[model samples]
Target chain A: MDQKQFEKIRAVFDRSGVALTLVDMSLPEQPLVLANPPFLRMTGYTEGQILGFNCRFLQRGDENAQARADIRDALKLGRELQVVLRNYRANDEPFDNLLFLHPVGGRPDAPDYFLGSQFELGRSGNSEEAAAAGHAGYLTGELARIGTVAARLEMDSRRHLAQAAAALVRAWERRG
Target chain B: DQKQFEKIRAVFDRSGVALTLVDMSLPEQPLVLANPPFLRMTGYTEGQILGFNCRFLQRGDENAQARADIRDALKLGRELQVVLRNYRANDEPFDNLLFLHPVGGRPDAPDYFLGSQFELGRSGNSEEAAAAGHAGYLTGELARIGTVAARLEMDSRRHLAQAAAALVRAWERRG
Candidate 1:
């Protein structure tokens, strides 16, 4: 896809809330060009630290040799596959990674990019696009809640209540 | 190993989240890398961002507490997340959920700081208003294909965004 089309698709994947990743097939080593926030947050790795390295760093060691080979074989043939990867976080914490890898653009023979999805492998559930929609609802609600209290504090216009509100929220957060 | 990094970079090529890397060791911790989504989120160009601090997005909202929280975090070299009243280039106020963490360092000296910006959207978005009854471009499409790719992977883990949501909710839960 062209840059415009790629961007549109990129928006969908980036906002998916799922740990989605994209790899450039045409480039050598299939370097990672993008990883959704969830994947980076999940693995505790900055996009830069692992940006040029294999995500196998998530593997810790030879913990998933066959899984790595499976990825190679699938990429060599331009096929899509899923495998359980024993990936580690940047903090040296290990977890079972249920990865969903696919070829984008329909034609596997010469796919333009590879998309990989990651999950905790424990919090399995049914499709919830609607749930995803509603869940964000609670977030916006909470956002409003803070704003309301802060606004009321700002209303006092004295004793620095308004400014204090932001600090209070931040302090509570620093703890929570 | 370089080959591995290449593949990983490819993955980041299409990410939608506004991600950035700032050189903490440099003066003012100037931005070194800013993904496309970051530019889109803040309406800034890479050329405009690369050598500047993320504070440019602040647009002067004057939230002192939020600023101090950030200052202390940087001074002590720790992770911090705060909801600040930041302004956009359009001069409109947007509540910015800012999360900052040290990416590299030994506590005494650091190399970089990774910043993730998540804009806490409105409760009733146009789609939400329409879908109160709807939408998943990522969920619907990926799930269908994932079933076919499954003979290979782990479990069906979905909607794990809570980790991030809670991370940002640090300010959100004040109520």
Candidate 2:
């Protein structure tokens, strides 16, 4: 894409309704680096309160659950993982958190960030059944498969860019 | 994966929401796929828009700050939400509500950035609403646009005349 086309990709995304949060996987605790307004409304935290802290702050006392372990393992393996977490609002109200987490940027061995798409997980049962159960008539049964598609595209582009960047490096080496 | 994709296609094509999948793996991130709702709402066919970048929706830099924010966000691989001045196929511009983020990859390498769009042209000022209603709903996209337009009206009030006038101009453009 040309520069303007690329610019629109950013523009279009900035206006989406999906609740998106980006956490810094490179960080020791994987603190949140960014949260869209929907994400803010989801958890009732101001940008100040939420940024620079581990997302676990929302888990309250449910950190030891198996879901958390599953998330950790996936992160360690550099793979995408989705889990329904019992998270608390700033008001201390409890809600089920259905989160879609994926490694982003760099490679599987050294990922730079984690992208999280969150749903309230609806009411009763896990998120899968929550939507199918007709709580909201929402169509997203799972966003994971979408993630792999996205990954494939990104890697393709990055693959080409890598070659170009390497050629430039080689030219510089010859000059040196 | 095939079953899942077909299952996903079955689910999303009928969805009221407009979702676009840009091929981040390709140079320039050309749009690889846009669901039916997106195609209908934008007045562009999938074939027409598929190989193109989305910025074609914008002609100039009126909302340059928002555009820059989007660029910054993507470069950092961060999640971004912004309002944009986007033009329809015929060239009338509307405020677009956009959310974008990487859909998959390692922390360092993601492959696709899923972009979801909602036009805020519906339910602006009275004339614009009339135009929007008659123009087309394209499923839930129209409803969502109207909802956001109403909300933007309230939000622009915080900035008073300066902010509110933008919404008014959208109506002016419609005529």
Candidate 3:
């Protein structure tokens, strides 16, 4: 994408209320390329502290085998999935994080980037069912919008964007 | 009540997006809430922006067609997306892509108007793209907020549903 197209995408990403992170999967260790303010606020970490590092740092020592394994499987396959993990903030406070991971970019067979959305679980009094529905719907909808925006900018990533969005909706629906 | 309000305030404050909530139930349709992003975007202090109609940003440049469209949408109680030339606190003009949605939704009277703002520049700007992105975010946040409000089983549930319905209509119409 050109500079103008990137600027527009970043504008939308930076202004969004959702906690969003984008990691460069093409790079070694898939270090984070972008971490918005909302994501920083949620993790109690500074941009200087977390960039260029694998998000696994948040997992710290409370890793679940199944969750980690599932994430590994999804990452290896370049698929989208959601998982809950006991993640630690910068201050060492533990919280259950509902995370949605999607592979993004126009590359076929391999994703150039991965998008991670973080929502703090147990923060609201709503039922799990309702909360899950809301989160899934939100990401699905946002991805669709992003795809449209990408196409308008002639980003050449619309195909992968569509695939990522479709995978999210399908996975969420199959979760039931 | 303090804790609940604080929680809501946290969500409202933490957002990076520019947004406002105007109480239509009140006379003159004054603003009840303005987030940090909105304040930063306009370079206005919270005290200065609140309790005032959003037209204050127009700063007498009310000749834009969007102004009339916004008025029409308000009269019809429908959601609208338009671009207007708005001024900041420094008197510098910026293109404001304004999105106005009735908070109370449709099929009933609107008690509030949720306004979201995005600054569009000359390059790489697409109204259709901006509208889609903003709609998705607005719809999603409203849904989550509705869920949060419903946790108390309060009276705001109907209003949220109405707003969601109106938003859906607004989004579908964009396509």
Candidate 4:
């Protein structure tokens, strides 16, 4: 995507009520390029503190190691995945973080961007399935809206969006 | 940290241009969020203005042309740029150059509408130019903010590497 398209996407992410983080895969460590207000509120971290860090900073030492490993493995393959990791807020408060990570951008095999949506498991509770489904649908809609405003997304970007949606559905079924 | 929150919040809240968001999921598309600038521009408290349709700003002198244009755009789920003669809470009229961008929405599902308002005073230049300029300015600010954050992260990584090396040396000495 061009600079203008990226800016429009950033504007949408900033105002969204959902907790969101955008990581630049093109950058070293794939550090966060943006984190919205809701994400900050959810993690109890300032934008400055979290922006450049790999989000793993939220993971307490060795907690949910298996889940962390799963996330890392999935990411290495440029695959979308959902995993619940035991994480801590900046205040050292612990919470179960249900994270959905999706590869974004114009290339499916080598996406240059990643989008993460985070939710607290405790709050999501019994409605977690519905919440995950709703978020997946929201992601699809947002991608479509971005395409509308910025002309058209590249074919690979559109394909990645579809795969992300499918991965979300698989995650939902896995819970059954 | 609270101040830090304010610092980030101010990026959008203290923006010179007015901004508001309406929830398309709700009936009548009630306003769900508004910046301080928008509240000041409309002369209404956050409590008083939210949960109402943006029509409240129009009051009785609804400009048919502008409303028609906005309605059509919303119906088709598209962006809109139009000038309106909207009223303040105190019943004062002002020229509102409004720009609306549709957020996430599917043919079957509702989404959101992000509205930016520019009050054109006597010094108002090109409405289109102002629209383009302010939009670019907000995104530019975000980009600059990210650059700083990215720099900080790099410094953080340096510290982590230094600590790791220290730990390795200590372990070697024990051996």
Docking quality class, candidate 3 = incorrect
Off by over 4 Å in 3: A1-5, A148-176, B1-100, B103-175
**lDDT of model 1, residue B73:** 86
Greater DockQ among 2 and 3 belongs to: 3
TM-score of chain B of 3: 0.70
Rank by lDDT (best first): 3, 4, 2, 1
C-alpha RMSD values across all candidates: 17.9, 20.6, 14.4, 20.6
Global lDDT for candidate 1? 0.52
Model 2, runs deviating above 4 Å: A1-13, A62-64, A123-176, B1-175
Query: Each model's DockQ?
Result: 0.03, 0.02, 0.06, 0.02
Error of 3 at B32 (Å): 29
**CAPRI quality level assigned to candidate 1 from its DockQ score:** incorrect
Residues A45-148, model 4: lDDT tens digits: 88988878898888778777788788777677777777767789888999877687877775656677878877565463233333333343334334433343
TM-score of chain B of each: 0.64, 0.64, 0.70, 0.65
> What is the interface root-mean-square deviation of candidate 2?
19.3
Arrange candidates by TM-score, descending. 3, 4, 1, 2
Q: DockQ winner among the candidates?
A: 3
lDDT of 1 by residue, B1-175 (tens): 2453243233233432345778777878898778776677677778967898888777655778889988888867776656677666666777766656565556745566656565665433222211211111111212222211322111211232333334334545567
Per-residue accuracy of model 3 over A1-176 as CA lDDT, tens digit each: 11343454576466555678888877769898789887899899889988899999997765667889998787878887677777899999998777878777655547777788876766545333333333443455445444422222221122232223334333444655
